[PDB]
Amino acid sequence: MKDKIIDNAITLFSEKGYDGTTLDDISKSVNIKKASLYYHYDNKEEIYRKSVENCFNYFIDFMYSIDGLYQFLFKFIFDVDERYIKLYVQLSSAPEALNSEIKHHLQEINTTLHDELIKYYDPTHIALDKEDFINMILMFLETWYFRASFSQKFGIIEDSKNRFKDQVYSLLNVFLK
Amino acid sequence: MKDKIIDNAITLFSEKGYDGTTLDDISKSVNIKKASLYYHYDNKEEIYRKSVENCFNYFIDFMMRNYSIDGLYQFLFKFIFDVDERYIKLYVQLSSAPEALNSEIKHHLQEINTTLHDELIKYYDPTHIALDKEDFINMILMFLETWYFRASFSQKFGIIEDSKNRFKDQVYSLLNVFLK
Incomplete structure (x- = not known):
């Protein structure tokens, strides 16, 4: 139960x-x-505290060639449940007593993601320097968290999974050889 | 009153x-x-309905009152630094609004996306930007959406990674890569 x-x-x-x-x-x-x-x-x-703990465990569990990077992003868009993404975005309204414990979880998630992106960064195949590559990918992810929080509720085609995937892949095609 | x-x-x-x-x-x-x-x-x-309408009006007024390449850097700087946090927070919470407002909010969301797209694309100049027009506009729109996410978290948790200045510096570094 x-x-x-x-x-x-x-x-x-x-x-x-x-x-x-x-x-x-x-x-x-x-x-x-x-x-x-x-x-x-x-x-x-x-x-709510237990639901947020389950959310962080879901994202930790969820988480190195160029093809591998495309697949990491594809899975994030199509295999991550929007209810967990929405719960994550909503952390900004969490009850105040949970601020510090949630901040700790966010810092751990951020470090884990950074460490994974460093493994994919290869200047022989990516025309961005390290920081710009990492930042661009983090902005793609944060953009999807924002769009997915609206996508199902309103069904606006501009917030859809395949439109986002195709915009991201177009940009990656430019910077990843 | x-x-x-x-x-x-x-x-x-x-x-x-x-x-x-x-x-x-x-x-x-x-x-x-x-x-x-x-x-x-x-x-x-x-x-609440009037509050949401005020919120959409605020963003359209802001975007339209704030087309050289340095003008683009300025637009982004002002969006990050000067947009009122309370409005960003109200905006992101629109996905959990009363059901009676669904169509009104949906249509306003569509109108703001069209407005931003049409306004920001005026800064595209192929003699200066290496990206094509479509990729340029999509990337700029993602900088704005990313800030809605980061601003809300920075206010609540104070994660330096989400600050105004840090984000502005990351955006400027990417705009520099896009320029020839």
Whole structure:
């Protein structure tokens, strides 16, 4: 039941935001009463803390030729669930008591990603210097986190997965030989 | 009074979200009784709608009031440094807005993307930029979208990696690569 609660809370928090999600919403999703969720399992802030922990573990788990770099980006676009991306973007509204623990998780994610990108950086195949390459890729990822947070909700074609992939691949074709 | 109420509601909705903000919070922010909000609005949903419309107007005004290559560096610098954080935060939270606003928000999002695209592309000059026009505009639009993400995180967590100056320096370094 605990796993089912966290799985459904991630869906709900991503759709409505922390402030817009109630214990009644979460409890109804797993067929229990709102007071039973609170007393048998956890208050809302702790369910959110556990959902965010599951989110960071999902992104850590998820994570060196040029073809390999294209595939890393393809998987990020097509294999990463938008509810986890949306939950991640929404961290900027997290309850204040969780600020420090979330900041630590963000710093770890950022370091891990940087270290992976350094493994792909090869100036014999990339016409950017190291920092510009790393920064460009990080901007592609952050752009997708932004677009995916809007994509499903509004279905605007400009925010779609294949349009993003094709814009990114066009730019990579220019800088990666 | 309406300008005051909306300015204050944007601050509250950006910080607490739609459901997290109450009419009492809004009325208290401008020093009036809750009942007095009804001289101008019918409910919280309408105040949020007006707040979102104000938000879109703010971004269009900003983009249109802020075409040489150095003018492009300046545009980007001003977007990063001068766009009000509360508006970026309200904007990113539009994907979790009340269902009744879905079509209105969708259409405004489409209009802002078209406006930015059409405005920023005026800075394209093939004698100076090595990228073609399409790749140039797509990359510039991604710098703007990346800032919505970074600004929200920098404000909340203070991660140096997300700061105004750091981002501006990374953007300038990429613009330099794009120039011949």
